[PDB]
């Protein structure tokens, strides 16, 4: 019985591959040619944020484009006004081994988690004048790798037990479980309208998920190793990925196949983080060789470098208005660039 | 100063936060951080009992020095993704059970794990404390059954003396970084406080080496 099912699976895979090949007629490179290059891109350090005493793992910008939160190995969460380098809040964490953090769109809450296997929710605005923990989400059986808020009462998480989840913050229960991956899920990215999301895992594949229905609609393959980072394109019809094979790739939803590859022979280390600019003309990636590279999205040219850190570039982010870029590293410093 | 009354109050609050962060860091620097690794059924629980989710943390104070132990047995996920978090520990304690050679066999599993840990890039200058457990049952068992089941080459007498040394040298052969690190090997005694003493003696040398590096003499 099992052999017949295996035969049916392999036949269906050949079908899907044939259909994808039939769609492909011209490449992006041919289409986006004979158009002027962006030219050299140069940016400078505007601010230096000092105060963590260990490795930094995560950062996330607030929706006003002025405030931000950071997480470090020392058990501290810090909120930073970025025009004046002032400290708004410092939060002590119960468990030191933290891997991710998030900022709510309203501005009222923050979340963090890690090797304790729990997601914690912190209320920023109270009548006693101090920050306190509001919720602890305890379902997962592996470590937490990422989290993002949809509103003030729903959050979505990923874990090292190969599963994603959707939560109801008020009741503390899981509403939907996403279970299709075979390796540790490392990263998630939400769509602009919030009806869909994409995830990347250690089995070297990416999946597209439907929030309301709870099902997997599409699977994307092509990398040769662990996918560490994933981000949505601004109109919501494409996404990009970065892996341990020292490459980045672009995938189109409606054509359901790969569009372009970003790599250079000099680079042989992995990629840790990825992001787009306001119009999506530039792609920005952090590396393990202490540097950030800047890429033309439509062409596959290197346009610039951000060479300012003494150890690994763990995290990066771009503001909603499009004004500044933030980078965090394992040397304990956060830099702002423009 | 081109600043307002509220701007000056905000700057004063920020400096009163920087002060507290520096105090907490100074307190944290003195603590001794230990990592605890072993395969299942290796006697870890006896060590944990005698000395004082995804991770379990224990703390105790012995002779004016403060100790924090972390156990990561229950993670059951890919180790490469999280092992780099523990770079910077003072030392690693590895537990092995001597009786588990009859029962591939568990001994080859333990040797594989020890080899993979020891030669890791993250832990190049980290000292390892090796505990060999279950002396008693090893001594009864070895009489009945010879050591050749685990090891074909062994020629020595089937007695405790030669077997313990042969196993010790088998584990010590795996080290390939003899210059930078020392492997401390102990035969665990159940009813004693010798184990804690042994660990304290081993960590004192690490502290001395750190102070020589900081002063600039080394």
């Amino acid at each position, epitope marked *: 019985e099992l052999d017949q099912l295996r035969q049916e699976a392999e036949q269906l895979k050949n079908q899907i591959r044939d259909a994808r090949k039939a769609c492909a007629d011209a490449t992006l490179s041919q289409i986006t040619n004979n158009i002027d290059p962006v030219g050299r891109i140069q940016m400078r350090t505007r601010r230096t944020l000092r105060g963590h005493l260990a490795k930094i793992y995560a950062m996330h910008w607030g929706t006003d484009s002025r*405030l931000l939160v950071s997480a470090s190995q020392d058990g501290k969460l810090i909120i930073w*006004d970025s025009y004046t380098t*002032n400290k*708004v809040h410092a939060i002590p964490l119960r468990s030191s081994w933290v891997m991710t953090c998030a900022y709510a769109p309203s501005g009222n809450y923050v979340a963090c988690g890690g090797l304790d296997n729990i997601c914690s929710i912190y209320n920023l605005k109270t*009548r*006693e*004048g*101090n920050v306190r923990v509001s919720r602890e989400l305890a379902g997962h059986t592996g470590y937490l790798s990422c989290c993002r808020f949809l509103d003030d009462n729903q959050i979505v998480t990923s874990s090292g037990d190969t599963t994603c989840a959707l939560w109801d913050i008020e009741t503390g229960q899981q509403t939907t479980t996403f279970t299709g991956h075979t390796g540790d899920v490392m990263s998630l990215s939400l769509a602009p309208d919030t009806r869909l999301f994409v995830s990347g895992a250690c089995d070297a594949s990416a999946k597209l998920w439907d929030v309301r229905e709870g099902m997997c609609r599409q699977t994307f393959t092509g990398h040769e190793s662990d996918i560490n980072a994933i981000c949505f394109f601004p109109n919501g019809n494409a996404f990009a990925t970065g892996s341990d094979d020292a490459t980045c790739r672009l995938f189109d939803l409606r054509a359901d196949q790969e569009l372009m590859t970003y790599s250079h022979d000099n680079i042989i280390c992995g990629i840790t983080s990825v992001s787009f600019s306001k119009s999506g003309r530039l792609l920005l990636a952090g590396y393990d060789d202490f540097n950030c590279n800047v890429w033309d999205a439509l062409k596959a040219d290197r346009a610039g470098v951000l060479a300012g850190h003494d150890n690994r570039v763990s995290c990066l982010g771009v503001t909603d208005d499009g004004m500044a870029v933030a980078t965090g590293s394992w040397d304990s410093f956060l830099k702002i660039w423009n | 100063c*081109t600043l*307002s*009354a*509220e*701007d000056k*109050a*905000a700057v*004063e*609050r920020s400096k*009163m936060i920087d002060r507290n962060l520096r105090e907490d860091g100074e307190k944290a620097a003195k603590e001794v951080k230990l990592l605890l690794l072993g395969a299942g059924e290796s006697g870890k629980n006896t060590i944990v009992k005698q000395m004082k989710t995804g991770i379990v943390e224990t703390h105790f104070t012995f002779k004016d020095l403060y100790f924090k132990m972390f156990d990561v047995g229950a993670q059951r996920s890919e180790r490469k993704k999280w092992i780099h978090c523990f770079e910077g520990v003072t030392a690693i304690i590895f537990c092995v059970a001597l009786s588990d050679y009859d029962l591939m066999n568990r001994m080859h599993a333990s040797m594989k794990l020890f080899d993979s840990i020891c030669n890791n890039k993250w832990f190049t200058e980290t000292s390892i404390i090796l505990f060999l457990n279950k002396k008693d049952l090893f001594e009864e068992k070895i009489k009945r059954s010879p050591l050749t089941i685990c090891y074909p080459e062994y020629t020595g007498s089937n007695t405790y003396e030669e077997a313990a040394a042969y196993i010790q040298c088998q584990f010590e052969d795996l080290n390939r970084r003899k210059d930078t690190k020392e492997i401390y090997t102990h035969f665990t005694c159940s009813t004693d406080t010798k184990n804690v003493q042994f660990v304290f003696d081993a960590v004192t040398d690490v502290i001395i080496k750190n102070n020589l590096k900081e002063c600039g003499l080394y």
Partner: single-chain antibody, 232 residues
């Protein structure tokens, strides 16, 4: 969150007395504290400020040299030491908390007050009207002006509105000209220019009767405009 204050009573001239306030229900060490007074039929007058952590202290010129302000953080207590009391010191004294960071609301919680009877280059604020007659269900507008521009180079206008209902301590309504305080209905709105300001009430309700006050926070000393009373 309660602030209870004590001391006061009847004092002879050329005397000394100390007043106290005890705090409960909040993180007292994180807030700066202020003392403010009101004479028997006059308006509000600022007295003194002590910051969080005790680094900064300020006093009014009228009282400087004769008054001392201190805090005890483990006991959660605030103190005011007075000496050489004058006839002009007869008043009701109040305690106010304030916290300062980006996006906060200073002057949000006031205390009940205590009464002392003694036996026997500053920005000016102008409120030009009093005793405006009105009836429930109608809109209203109130205007306050200044002798100097309250707009700063950073981008903020430092103007505040307060309401004192009969028999009660003051309450904050609008901070920094355009923002609405927590727990306050959306009827109220604040708008203004560099030197002229207005407060608008869309539909009046019976509870809205009392006196309205404007304040500036650009510079020290802090200065209060006269009142404006809504009758019925």
């Amino acid at each position: 969150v309660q602030l209870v204050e004590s001391g006061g009573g009847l004092v002879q001239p050329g005397g000394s007395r100390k007043l106290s306030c005890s705090a409960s229900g909040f993180a007292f060490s994180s807030f700066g504290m202020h003392w403010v007074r009101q004479a028997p039929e006059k308006g509000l007058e600022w007295v003194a400020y002590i910051s969080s952590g005790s680094g900064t202290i300020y006093y009014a010129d009228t009282v400087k040299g004769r008054f001392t302000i201190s805090r005890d953080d483990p006991k959660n207590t605030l103190f005011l030491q007075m000496t050489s009391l004058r006839s002009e010191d007869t008043a009701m004294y109040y305690c106010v908390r304030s916290i300062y960071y980006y996006g906060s609301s200073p002057f949000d919680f006031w205390g009940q007050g205590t009464t002392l009877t003694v036996s026997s280059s500053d920005i000016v604020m102008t409120q030009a009207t009093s005793s405006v007659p009105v009836t429930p269900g109608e809109s209203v507008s109130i205007s306050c002006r200044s002798s100097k521009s309250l707009l700063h180079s950073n981008g903020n206008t430092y103007l505040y509105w307060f309401l004192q209902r009969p028999g009660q301590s003051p309450q904050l309504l609008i901070y920094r000209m355009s923002n609405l305080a927590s727990g306050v209905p959306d009827r109220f709105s604040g708008s203004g220019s560099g030197t002229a300001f207005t407060l608008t009430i869309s539909r009046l309700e019976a509870e809205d009767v009392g006196v309205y006050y404007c304040m500036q926070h650009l510079e020290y000393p802090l200065t209060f405009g006269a009142g404006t009373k809504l009758e019925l």
